[PDB]
Amino acid sequence: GIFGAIAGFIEGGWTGMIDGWYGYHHENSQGSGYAADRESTQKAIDGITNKVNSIINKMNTQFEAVDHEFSNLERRIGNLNKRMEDGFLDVWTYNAELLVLLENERTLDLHDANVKNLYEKVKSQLRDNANDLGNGCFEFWHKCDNECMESVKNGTYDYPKYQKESKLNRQGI
């Protein structure tokens, strides 16, 4: 993946997370679950939808071919019409095919970046209160509440509050 998260340092998707594109998986003494991040998911949806609609709108013009006949003394204009029509056809076929290859590449990148940015959003909050396992997972050095998981997700995580417990744990080991 170009941002390196999707099919990258985060190896796989979650079939379990059915309510979003991007998300959090948590495990705690209370339970374990998959929860989508509403904001990043919705922004991605609004943007991708807009991209599809913009492409559709820019493309809703048509070149119209004609049924006109040409006489045996009209080979040159007849051929002119044919080369003209084929020419526009080739231009538009090219425009759509290339635009689809290009945009598919860029769309997959945009998803990859959104995943990467959520992961970083978490890493900066946790700091050394958690240990980075691979695959985009963090192990807290402290007991983390449901309320605590929510705080990480909604950006409210309190690093000082768990700092002593965490340090004690991190280096008791």
Partner 1 sequence: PGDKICIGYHANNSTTQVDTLLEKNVTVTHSVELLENQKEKRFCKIMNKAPLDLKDCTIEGWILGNPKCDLLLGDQSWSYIVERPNAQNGICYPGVLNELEELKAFIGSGERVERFEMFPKSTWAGVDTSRGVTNACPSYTIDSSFYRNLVWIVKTDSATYPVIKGTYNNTGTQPILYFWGVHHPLDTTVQDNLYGSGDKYVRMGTESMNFAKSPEIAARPAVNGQRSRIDYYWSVLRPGETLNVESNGNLIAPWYAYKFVSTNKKGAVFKSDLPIENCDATCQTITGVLRTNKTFQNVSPLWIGECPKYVKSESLRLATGLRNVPQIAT
Ligand X SMILES: *[C@@H]1O[C@H](CO)[C@@H](O)[C@H](O)[C@H]1NC(C)=O
Footprint of ligand X on this chain (CB under 6 A)?
Answer: 147, 150-151, 154, 156
| DSSP H or E run through 130 | strand 130-132
Q: Which of residues 46-65 bind partner 1 (CB under 8 A)?
A: 46-52, 54-56, 59-65
Nearest to 145 by CA among 127, 117, 165: 165
Q: Among a second copy, partner 1, ligand X, none, what binds residue 154 when CB lies within 5 to 8 Å by partner kind?
A: ligand X
Give the three-class secondary structure for 35. Answer: strand
Query: What does the alpha-carbon distance between residue 135 and residue 57 come to, in Å, rounded to a whole number?
Result: 40
Give the three-class secondary structure for 74. Answer: coil
- Residue with smaller CB distance to ligand X, 64 or 147: 147
Give yes or no for residue 107 binding a second copy (CB under 8 A).
no
Q: Which two tokens stand for residue 141?
A: 């050095």
DSSP string, 51-67: HHHHHHHHT--------
Cβ atoms within 10 A of the Cβ of 159, count? 14
Of the residues 56, 64, 72, 172, which one makes contact with a second copy according to CB under 8 A: 64
First to last CA, the chain: 35
> From the CB of 28, what's the least distance to a second copy, in Å?
22
> From the CB of 121, what's the least distance to partner 1, in Å?
8
Q: Among a second copy, ligand X, partner 1, none, what binds residue 115 when CB lies within 5 to 8 Å by partner kind?
A: partner 1
> From the CB of 147, what's the least distance to ligand X, in Å?
4
Binding mask 12-51 for a second copy (x = CB under 8 A): ----------------------------------------
